[PDB]
Ligand binder design. Sequence first.
Ligand SMILES: [Zn+2]
Ligand SMILES: [Zn+2]
Ligand SMILES: [Zn+2]
Lengths: 63, 63
Amino acid sequence: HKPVPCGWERVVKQRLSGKTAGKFDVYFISPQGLKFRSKRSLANYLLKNGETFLKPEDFNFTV
Amino acid sequence: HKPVPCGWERVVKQRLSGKTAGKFDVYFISPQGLKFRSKRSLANYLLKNGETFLKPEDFNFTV
DNA sequence: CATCCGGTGA
DNA sequence: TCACTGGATGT
Ligand SMILES: [Zn+2]
Ligand SMILES: [Zn+2]
Ligand SMILES: [Zn+2]
């Protein structure tokens, strides 16, 4: 059970078409509206920016 | 030097990143372009299709 | 399978 | 950061 960082938005989406219909994908939206499809891309974002407070583990990409 | 079945392609690949980096995997490509990363999956493919001629043992996944 | 991101095209 | 999916990759 894991809370979502202030200003951020967590989106649970379901795939509609393709061989992968029904599959789920989680992604996050920053307070600035940048969208992250993975914990790695988000983590790289935290590094580029020198975020000290937020940790990659604060973001829950599982459903 | 176990031979590779006609029309099939055998690929020996090395892992570039992560924890088991530098390890080799083998996979096969059918004459139709389906890729099999494991022996079990290829064998299950031979069954679902009733392949009588090819045997799982014709496919060498070791490196 | 969990996790990822490049390909694709509206 | 285009939204959404295919299928590569290492666990
Ligand atoms: Zn808050
Ligand atoms: Zn020989
Ligand atoms: Zn031949």
